[PDB]
Design a protein around this ligand. Structure first.
Ligand code: A1IMO
Ligand code: A1IMO
Ligand code: Y01
Ligand code: Y01
Ligand code: CA
Ligand code: CA
Lengths: 702, 50, 702
């Protein structure tokens, strides 16, 4: 009618009035009342000690809820049903209740069937409770690899996919617990590295629950960094960062022997671990080996020093070849000195690239097969060193990791173009033997192609210098952030390409009828690169270029007119061009700006850690003694168990102290959390109520 | 003389600002709980009957 | 030395050991120990009951600090020095302590000398404590007007400017207290309106303490808004909003004069008060008088009925002239109907403006003094109505209207240009009496000037339509926000104006030597508006235009060349132009974008309240009976004390209920929103400590 009648739709069994008062005594902390009710129920059988409150909490759960230990024992002495009260006690994190339930030796539950006491204890991250359970010989299921097709993995995901996914996530939540790792992991730092990396990969395959796995991975990364924060001496830091996880094997003498664990952290992308200030401070000492007081020096002394060694790079390179053991032959081995020498050896190459077009000899513009000039001869040894150095990393590093770095893609294209230029120059030298005016050369003359290929390589070579910004504290953080914004921009370029193709097809479909010949155009020039632009939309290839150039306003409006002056056709074509301008320049261009502003804000809060990780990779590439000589000069031609066992003993001693300090700090950091909840107010109120009842029980003259 | 008065006022203000600035922590709840437990045990020493 | 020796630099008098334990008893809540020490102090004279702890807190201040009333009476009974104890009790907000000190009847203090018990109580905003003090016949100094030159204001400012400024702010903090206003203000809503407005003006004169006064003004605005929120019926809301504070004449017909309190709120810029949903709901009922179910109607029905009334605007206007009391003559008086009729009468005017350029008799391009055409004759009555409406509205509005809203500036310029056009066409009609080819007309021919002036007015008339966006829910909020961004943009144009002048002076100083004559230019055209631009920087006036047009890329680069081909001069001039382009287009343009983005974010959070305030002013301008006829038709030609007393009695009754509800809500809102502090933890600990000591004193057995 005009009123909605409210009733209980899913009614449960009602609780007797006798049981209602019995539960109220437990909440109030009334020990005396509870003791009588339990004793009375032993004979009369009037109240149910296992009274199931519709909420599911029995007296035992209420006793655990309030942390009232003494009443708990009073109920447990009466043979009350236990069920899974251990999980409830563990979740409450009351050590007294957990110990009592351990020593003590259909239904609705707040926990899924897969949760075990050890797994739940690790979820809470309580060191004390986890230690109690681990001491009682507990185990946790081992999760299968992400890409597993075994019968169990496939069959389990068939019967119940929801339960299978939740069970796997619960296991990883327990394994990623810092308290469990510190207690049961032989090498907690390595365990956190591998576990966090495995969780990051899981967050991709299991995209539905990506956020959950990414939070676990971040938790593992934080734990390793926090363990490193507890180092108190340089000796402790040296032991941790130089530890080898029992490699044995053979180590390349050309490689860098030390910092084994730091390199492992870089491999697993532990950016916070690498960016730790004490780790960074140690790295700077190695990087600045020859300058003990580099930081204290004025910016003028630094700048003046850099050019001095840079100008002497030819001399240092020669010394390393002639007398490597000599005093001067050892300077090039210092990582920062070697970095400056390589940079100087590259700035010299770029300077000679400028000189290629600054020297012109008349009558040499017509030699079809001209030989290398003076500048080209000096450039040649540099190019061979660059190609040799890149191939030297092909076998040394491998195909897979080389392509992972975007700067290597530019290095490959640059070297390929230089190789093509050399071969093309050779073919022209052999095929032709005279001079002919350049105006009569064909479109695809080998000399013309070589000049274009050489010029393209020059642009790529110059752009390579941007990678050196990582070494600078002012430019490196900005350069790294700019490269992180390019991935977002590339996605937006997919939508613009669809728009460009859609309008290019429509415009070409309309204008291809009116294509004219170059002979009929003024100056005999056809296309949009002429002084009087024409045939803008005659072909699809030309149409794509015309729409590209209109983005910069370089396409004139009169290109929409045809010679026949078909008014309706011209207006329609100009409306397509106008609509394209609105979509690309008024809408899409501004949308990219809005997205870039939002994406840069997020990138800006992690710029420091990202740059420091990038600079660490740059520094470590100069610690090795493999590529000491710059490109100009790089082409000129027992029982180990005792050592490994002792090295492991020292690592274990340091790990033991780090865990002790970390555990205390985390236990300390919780007591100052600066927050309170209702469960604390409930517990405090219950304490007074219990005290009041106990005091009142001792009445006097009644 | 002026510096002496400024420090006196500043110290009182900072001591004042703390008692109203930050909320309670776990260390306060533990302290309050222990106070009741100590009082309960001390009172229970004088048991009139048992 | 290599160590810094730390010592007490400003040492105070040390406190005896006997006094140290005496104070510790007060903090612990040990009543028994304090009672004996005080009683012993009456004989031995060993400890001073007034022991001044270096912190300044005596026993009395400690007793007040812990809210231990029983002990505080114990010390008060012993004749301890009080001093400024009342202020400390008031600040603590302990009602029990304040009553005790009131009934009880240079040292360091935490309060400035100007603070009084009533002022401090108002600062805390405690209703209960403020009521206790007000009942005891207290008063507060009246602050002088902001611009006061009396002997006291000038002498106080010169004697002690710092103390004078602080005393004024302390008084205004007390007067702006919502609790004090609710208790002692005859009309709390009016008091909050005036007090908040006065504080906003003060925040401008007092530049140093602008933030403090702006927070007080915001506090007054919130209080009035919150009082209105407590209205529970439409009758209560009607009584509040229709209340007239005074009864001086105020009976002019053709005036709505029915929402006096609401109009007062608009005058004082009480935007939150006006934007209150219940106030807005009542206004919409009056605005939609003829459409009881406007909100429930589909957007198509709404749109269909808008054109029907708009097309009928000529008929409704006539009816209001012939038979105002008739059924049809009353429709135009409904505010929403009248608004549509005025809008329709204006869209018709704009339509005829378009027709002025479509129907011009051919061969009449040469009539020097042409008479008005067909379209001009119809436009004439509209213009006279617009001019008459502005003069008519200015007579009652006053000569201060032009400074209120920037839309009236456009109406003044638009009407002035229309008047100039009419006079100019009259002069041409009388001066000339024939037709002559337009090519031979002089630069300042009256007919040419009139055409230019008329065209400028057309742009202004069309732009006027933007003000109608305020009535729309979708466009109004955006249009209002755009107008709020224009004030920030105007600041930026000051920096760009100086940059433009700096480079214009430099470029003209360099190029004025090479000015050429129009006869020597191709096509005899001189300037940058020619097909081949020339003389871009010949004169300062031309240089300013050239730099303006380069902002849009309409100035070609070749204008930097001179005929004599002075290479050094041309390069310098092109470098000035290039530097100007960098500063204006790469730097200043982007800085404006960054500034606009930041300012829009702040404006966006207040857009709803600002738009609703603007729309309320729009609606209320159509409630009055004065300007019912649109411009086209707007030129055609008993004891009052008894009513005022009853109207005031009902207002007081409603105000009494609103204050009661508001006070309870604020007392309610504090107990569920404010978190705990150290003062609460200290109080709770002391309670247990006091109880523990009291119990142990009397064992109660044996
Ligand atoms: C896409 N487009 C176009 O291609 N041309 C060139 C045609 C061939 O020259 C146009 O002129 C043209 C056009 N969009 C036009 O208005 C749009 C522009 C945008 C920015 C999308 N907003 O904001 C609105 C408010 C929707 C108006 N106009 C101008 C125009 C308008 C009316 C008439 Cl009757 C004639 C022209
Ligand atoms: C103001 N200015 C200018 O007026 N002209 C026109 C001269 C007359 O044609 C230029 O060519 C010109 C110029 N600023 C130039 O470089 C600047 C441009 C800005 C954007 C300010 N950033 O980013 C830096 C990195 C500082 C380079 N260049 C180009 C140039 C550079 C070197 C040489 Cl040797 C010759 C030209
Ligand atoms: C006029 C423009 C094109 C610049 C000149 C061209 C080159 C000579 C520049 C381009 C990038 C420059 C490099 C950018 C970054 C660095 C890292 C920098 O390393 C540090 O010692 C940084 C120390 C710090 O962190 O402050 C040493 C100079 C170097 C190699 C620069 C050397 C000079 C380079 C090659
Ligand atoms: C293309 C140009 C030349 C058209 C003419 C100018 C417009 C900007 C005018 C014509 C009709 C006007 C509208 C006439 C009536 C309404 C309805 C009115 O809304 C209501 O009262 C209904 C509830 C709501 O939508 O807020 C708000 C103003 C608005 C949108 C007006 C805003 C200004 C408009 C769109
Ligand atoms: Ca490479
Ligand atoms: Ca006006």
């Amino acid at each position: 009618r005009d009123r909605i009648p409210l009733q209980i739709v899913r009614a449960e069994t009602e609780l007797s009035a006798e049981e209602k008062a019995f539960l109220n005594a437990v909440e109030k902390g009334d020990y005396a009342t509870v003791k009588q009710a339990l004793q009375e129920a032993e004979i009369y059988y009037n109240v149910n000690i296992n009274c199931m409150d519709p909420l599911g909490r029995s007296a035992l759960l209420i006793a655990i809820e309030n942390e009232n230990l003494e009443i708990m024992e009073l109920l447990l002495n009466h043979s009350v049903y236990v069920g899974d009260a251990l999980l409830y006690a563990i979740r409450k994190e009351v050590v007294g209740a957990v110990e009592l339930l351990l020593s003590y030796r259909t239904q609705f539950s707040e926990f899924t069937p897969d949760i075990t006491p050890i797994m739940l204890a690790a979820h809470t991250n309580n060191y004390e409770i986890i230690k109690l359970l681990v001491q009682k010989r507990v185990t946790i299921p081992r999760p299968h690899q992400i890409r597993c097709n075994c019968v169990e993995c496939v069959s389990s995901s068939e019967v119940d996919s929801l339960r299978h996914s939740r069970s796997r996530l619960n296991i990883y939540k327990a394994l990623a617990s810092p308290s469990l790792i510190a207690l049961s992991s032989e090498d907690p730092i390595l365990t956190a590295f591998r576990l966090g990396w495995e969780l990051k990969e899981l967050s991709k395959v299991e995209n539905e629950f990506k956020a959950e796995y990414e939070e676990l991975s971040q938790q593992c990364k934080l734990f390793a960094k926090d363990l490193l924060d507890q180092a108190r001496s340089s000796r402790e830091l040296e032991i941790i960062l130089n530890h080898r996880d029992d490699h044995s094997e053979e180590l390349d003498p050309q490689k860098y022997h030390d910092l084994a664990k730091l390199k492992v952290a870089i491999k697993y992308h532990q950016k916070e671990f690498v960016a730790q200030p004490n780790c960074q401070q140690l790295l700077a000492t190695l990087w600045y080996d020859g300058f003990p007081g580099w930081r204290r020096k004025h910016w003028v002394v630094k700048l003046l020093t850099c050019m001095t060694i840079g100008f002497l790079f030819p001399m240092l390179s020669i010394a390393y070849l002639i007398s490597p053991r000599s005093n001067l032959g050892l300077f090039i081995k210092k990582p920062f000195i070697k970095f400056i020498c390589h940079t100087a050896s590259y700035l010299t190459f770029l300077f000679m690239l400028l000189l290629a077009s600054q020297h012109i000899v008349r009558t040499d513009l017509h030699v079809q097969g001209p030989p290398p000039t003076v500048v080209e001869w000096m450039i040649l040894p540099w190019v061979l060193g660059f190609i040799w150095g890149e191939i030297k990393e092909m076998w040394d590093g491998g195909f897979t990791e080389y392509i992972h770095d975007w700067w290597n893609l530019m290095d490959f294209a640059m070297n390929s173009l230089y190789l093509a230029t050399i071969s093309l120059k050779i073919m022209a030298y052999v095929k032709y033997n005279g001079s002919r005016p350049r105006e009569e050369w064909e479109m695809w003359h080998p000399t013309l192609i070589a000049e274009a290929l050489f010029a393209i390589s020059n642009i790529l070579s110059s752009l390579r210098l941007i990678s050196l910004f990582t070494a600078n504290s002012h430019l490196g953080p900005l350069q790294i952030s700019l490269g992180r914004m390019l991935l977002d921009i590339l996605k937006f370029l997919f939508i613009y390409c669809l728009v460009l193709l859609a309008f290019a097809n429509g415009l070409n479909q309309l204008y291809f009828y009116y294509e004219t010949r170059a002979i009929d155009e003024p100056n005999n020039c056809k296309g949009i690169r002429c002084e009087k632009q024409n045939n803008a939309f005659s072909t699809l290839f030309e149409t794509l270029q015309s729409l590209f150039w209109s983005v910069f306003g370089l396409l004139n409006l009169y290109v929409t007119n045809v010679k026949a002056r078909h008014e309706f056709t011209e207006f329609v074509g100009a409306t397509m061009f106008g609509t394209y301008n609105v979509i690309s320049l008024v809408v899409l261009l501004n949308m990219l700006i809005a997205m870039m502003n939002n994406s840069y804000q997020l990138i800006a809060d992690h710029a420091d850690i990202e740059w420091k990780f990038a600079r660490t990779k740059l520094w470590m590439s100069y610690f090795d003694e493999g590529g000491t000589l710059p490109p100009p000069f790089n082409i000129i031609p027992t029982e180990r168990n005792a050592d490994s066992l002792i090295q492991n003993q020292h690592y274990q001693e340091v790990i033991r102290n780090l865990v002790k300090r970390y555990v205390a700090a985390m236990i300390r950091n919780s007591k100052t959390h600066e927050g309170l909840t209702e469960e604390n107010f409930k517990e405090l109120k219950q304490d007074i109520s219990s005290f009041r009842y106990e005091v009142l029980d001792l009445l006097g003259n009644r």
